[PDB]
């Protein structure tokens, strides 16, 4: 038929009660599953949400049981991290004609950037020439922008890589895709494998290779699964590597900004920090060095979620601030300001939130006597400002701003990263009665700016901000069980997530769900044969511009009615979410 081939890889909708036994669930990639821990997340109160997402993040560190998917601590994973640390070494010995690229779209690309700076600092600090760089879907503007459409081109990924790979002679390309999903990455990896004598591809994600994407990429002939299958074969001869531990599903299904983002830093900082630290020692990096690092990162989680109660509250002040239709501000210094920006940008696509609903500031990059003049005026009784900084920062730069924001705002609150027994100047910092002090042990540090202390803090902030931003919106009633139904379809992956969600909630056939989705997307145009057979980017591009696409499609299905009828029905309910919930009853 027309469209049959575009949709060929979609498994049919199981008959009720047979979701398990048709083998459908076993086909859903780990990264997209519903985490059972979060089945009733739309009901958790602020303190549970914090617990539940604390539990989900912990799974990053959970070990392998006895037939089952390998994990962060399995010896096949750590061995591979050893081998890779190793290849990063060769390059560090030959900094002339040498380069190391970290690449991904979306948050994988953000993570890539963060880590390229750090590992560039570290080499600067020893007056070694910088070898790291990053690549993000849609260039550097993407690092601080919501730009979900940019990941779909394999040729774009190959372009951006051909740029930075110059006339260099040894290139390590660490391609990052939580889902083993992004076409951007796929093309980089396939390119690398064509020119081994220069390129070393290393692929980082969190699905087994047999769950890697196998739907066709519009500008490329092989799929992600093929590329990854072939990289795995090459690993036997140490010419490619696949680093792909399971870490369990995301608390909000498919939200790979969360665990996926964290596991990415954890996995790669670990392995890179080891690479360097063991070079000047003139010793092979070993599982033992990595493990120290990993266990530090696993302490970091326990440390970080010690502050759960105060985390829950900061979430409550954010929820109400956004219920009351206010705005929310995150202000922070050095890399923690960045991480702030990042969390706020992600709320746009992740929740259909406006770019002011939760905004991030660095000292986006709006300075002391700047933020005070421009942003400060328009704050309000109902708003919330959040301060994120270490005590090794300019605390006089800090207090000024809090002195000032105590004017319009009262719901402030802060996130203070001390190394133990640093005190916190002004005991009149009962500006924040119950701050979020997170205090870090003393450690042994050789390298420059105590990089492990950076990674810990960064990671803990990400955990905090993410849990908080995600937490706020669930509380608002905006999530359905642990799914975001009402997403904006802005790339092919989200198109598939939409379709899958229509099948899950309607229980109706694949062909009906596809029909309702394409009708909803293209309304008022009807299903022509061209539209049915069009490449998925055609639907993406049109859907990207609409509102309530997925709920209208689900409604069409549940009432077994038309798009005109479901739109009118929706317009008649108090809100999207009641329309949907009601219709499920």
Ligand X SMILES: O=S(=O)(c1cccs1)N1CCN(c2ccc(C(O)(C(F)(F)F)C(F)(F)F)cc2)CC1
Which residues are annotated as part of the binding site?
107-108, 151, 177-179, 346, 493
Residue 349 makes contact with ligand X by CB under 6 A? no
Q: How far is CA 165 from the centre of its chain?
A: 26
- Cα separation, 526 vs 537, in Å, equals 18
Site string for ligand S6P, 137-156 (x = CB under 6 A): -----------x--x-----
Among the candidate windows 25-33, 280-288, 422-430, 532-540, which touches ligand X by CB under 6 A?
Answer: 25-33
Please give the residues from 196 up to 215 whose contact with ligand X meets the rule CB under 6 A.
207, 213, 215
What are the distances in angstroms from CA 104 to CA 107, 244, 398, 501? 8, 15, 34, 25
Residue 103 makes contact with ligand S6P by CB under 6 A? no
Least separation in angstroms between CB 207 and ligand S6P? 9
| Nearest residue (CB) to ligand X, 98 versus 175 | 175
Q: Which residue has the tokens 């203070």?
A: 416
Site string for ligand X, 464-493 (x = CB under 6 A): -------------------x---------x
- Cα separation, 12 vs 25, in Å, equals 11
Residue 106 makes contact with ligand S6P by CB under 6 A? yes
Check if the beta carbon of residue 331 is closer than 8 Å to that of residue 386: yes
| Nearest residue (CB) to ligand X, 18 versus 295 | 18
Give the β-pairing of 384-390 and 414-419: parallel
For 230-279, give the secondary structure using H, E and C.
HHHHHHCCCCCEEECCECCCCCCCCCCCCHHHHHHHHHHHHHHHHHHHCC
Give the β-pairing of 328-332 and 359-362: parallel
Please give the residues from 294 up to 333 whose contact with ligand S6P meets the rule CB under 6 A.
none
Among the candidate windows 98-106, 217-225, 277-285, 562-570, which touches ligand S6P by CB under 6 A?
Answer: 98-106
Cα dihedral 257, 546, 571, 531 sign = negative
Count the Cβ atoms, other than its own, within 10 Å of residue 73.
Answer: 17
Least separation in angstroms between CB 64 and ligand S6P? 22
Residue 301 makes contact with ligand X by CB under 6 A? no
Site string for ligand S6P, 338-357 (x = CB under 6 A): -----------xx-------
Looking at 504, 522, 539, 569, which residue binds ligand X (CB under 6 A)?
A: 504
Site string for ligand S6P, 155-194 (x = CB under 6 A): ----------------------xxx-xx------------
Site string for ligand S6P, 232-271 (x = CB under 6 A): -----------------------xxx--x-----------
Looking at 276, 497, 522, 569, which residue binds ligand X (CB under 6 A)?
A: 497
Which of the choices ligand S6P, ligand X, none does residue 106 contact, using the CB cut-off of 5 to 8 A by kind?
ligand S6P
Among the candidate windows 26-34, 53-61, 392-400, 562-570, which touches ligand X by CB under 6 A?
Answer: 26-34
List binding-site positions for beta-D-fructose 6-phosphate: 107-108, 177-179, 493
Which of the choices ligand S6P, ligand X, none does residue 105 contact, using the CB cut-off of 5 to 8 A by kind?
ligand S6P
Count the Cβ atoms, other than its own, within 10 Å of residue 511.
Answer: 15
Least separation in angstroms between CB 531 and ligand X? 20
Check if the beta carbon of residue 220 is closer than 8 Å to that of residue 186: yes
Please give the residues from 160 up to 199 whose contact with ligand X meets the rule CB under 6 A.
179, 181
Among 151, 162, 134, CA closest to 185:
151
DSSP 81-108: HHHHHHHHHHHHH--TTEEEEEEESHHH
Cα dihedral 52, 54, 57, 58 sign = negative
Count the Cβ atoms, other than its own, within 10 Å of residue 248.
Answer: 23
Among 454, 451, 448, CA closest to 125:
448
Tokens of 175: 């391609």
Among the candidate windows 50-58, 404-412, 500-508, 537-545, which touches ligand X by CB under 6 A?
Answer: 500-508
Residue 107 makes contact with ligand S6P by CB under 6 A? yes
Count the Cβ atoms, other than its own, within 10 Å of residue 35.
Answer: 20
Check if the beta carbon of residue 3 is closer than 8 Å to that of residue 536: no
| Site residue total, ligand X (CB under 6 A) | 19
Q: Which residues bind ligand X (CB under 6 A)?
A: 28-29, 31-34, 179, 181, 207, 213, 215, 253, 483, 493, 496-497, 500-501, 504
Q: Which residues bind ligand S6P (CB under 6 A)?
A: 104-108, 148, 151, 177-179, 181-182, 255-257, 260, 349-350
């Amino acid at each position: 038929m027309p469209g049959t081939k575009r949709f060929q890889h979609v498994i049919e909708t199981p008959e009720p009660g047979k979701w398990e036994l048709s083998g459908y669930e076993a086909a859903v990639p780990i990264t997209e599953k519903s985490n059972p821990l979060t089945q009733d997340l739309d009901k958790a109160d602020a303190e549970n949400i914090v617990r539940l997402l604390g539990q989900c993040d912990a799974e990053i560190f959970q070990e392998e049981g006895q037939s089952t998917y390998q994990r962060l601590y399995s010896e096949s994973i750590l061995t591979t991290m050893v081998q890779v640390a190793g290849k990063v070494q060769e390059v560090l010995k030959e900094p002339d004609g040498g380069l190391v690229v970290l690449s991904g779209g979306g948050t994988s690309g953000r993570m890539a950037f963060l880590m390229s700076v750090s590992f560039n600092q570290l080499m600067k600090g020893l007056g070694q020439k910088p070898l790291y760089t990053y690549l993000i879907a849609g260039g550097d503007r993407s690092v601080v922008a919501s730009r979900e459409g940019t990941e779909d081109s394999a040729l774009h990924g190959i372009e951006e890589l051909k740029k930075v790979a110059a006339g260099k002679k040894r290139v390590i390309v660490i391609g990052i895709s939580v889902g083993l999903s992004a076409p951007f990455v796929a093309g980089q990896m396939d390119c690398c494998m064509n020119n081994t004598a220069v390129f070393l591809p290393v692929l980082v994600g969190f699905n087994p290779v047999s769950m890697a994407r196998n739907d066709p990429i519009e500008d490329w002939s092989s799929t992600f699964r093929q590329v990854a299958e072939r990289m795995q074969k090459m690993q036997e001869k140490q010419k490619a590597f696949v680093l792909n531990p399971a870490i369990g599903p995301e608390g909000l299904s498919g939200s790979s900004r969360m665990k996926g983002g964290s596991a990415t830093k954890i996995l790669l900082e670990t392995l890179l920090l080891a690479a360097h630290k063991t070079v000047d020692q003139g010793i092979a990096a070993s599982q033992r060095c990595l493990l120290e690092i990993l266990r530090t990162f696993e302490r970091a989680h326990q440390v970080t979620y010690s502050q759960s109660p105060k985390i829950a509250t900061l979430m409550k002040s954010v929820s109400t601030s956004l219920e009351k239709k206010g705005h929310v501000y995150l202000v922070g210094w050095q890399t923690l300001g960045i991480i702030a920006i990042m969390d706020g940008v992600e709320c746009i696509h992740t929740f259909g939130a406006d770019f002011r609903d939760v905004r991030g500031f660095l000292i986006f990059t709006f300075s002391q006597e700047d933020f005070l003049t421009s942003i400060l005026p328009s704050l309000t009784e109902i708003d919330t400002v959040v301060f994120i900084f270490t005590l090794d920062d300019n605390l006089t730069e800090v207090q000024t701003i809090v002195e000032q924001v105590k004017e319009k705002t009262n719901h402030i609150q802060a996130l203070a990263h001390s190394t133990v027994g640093q005190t916190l100047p002004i005991p009149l910092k009962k500006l924040f009665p119950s701050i979020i002090s997170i205090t870090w042990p003393l450690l042994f540090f050789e390298y420059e700016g105590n990089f492990i202390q950076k990674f810990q803090r960064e990671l803990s902030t990400k955990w905090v901000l993410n849990t908080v931003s995600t937490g706020a919106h669930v509380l608002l009633g905006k999530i359905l069980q642990n799914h975001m139904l009402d997403l904006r379809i802005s790339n092919s992956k989200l198109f598939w997530r939409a379709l899958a969600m229509l099948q899950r909630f309607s229980g109706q056939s694949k062909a009906r769900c596809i029909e309702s989705l394409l009708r909803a997307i293209h309304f008022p145009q009807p299903l022509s044969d061209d539209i049915r057979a069009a490449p998925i980017s055609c639907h993406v591009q049109v859907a990207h511009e609409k509102e309530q696409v997925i709920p209208i499609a689900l409604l069409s299905l549940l009432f077994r009615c038309s798009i005109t009828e479901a739109q009118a029905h929706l317009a008649a309910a108090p809100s999207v979410c009641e329309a949907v919930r009601s219709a499920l009853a």
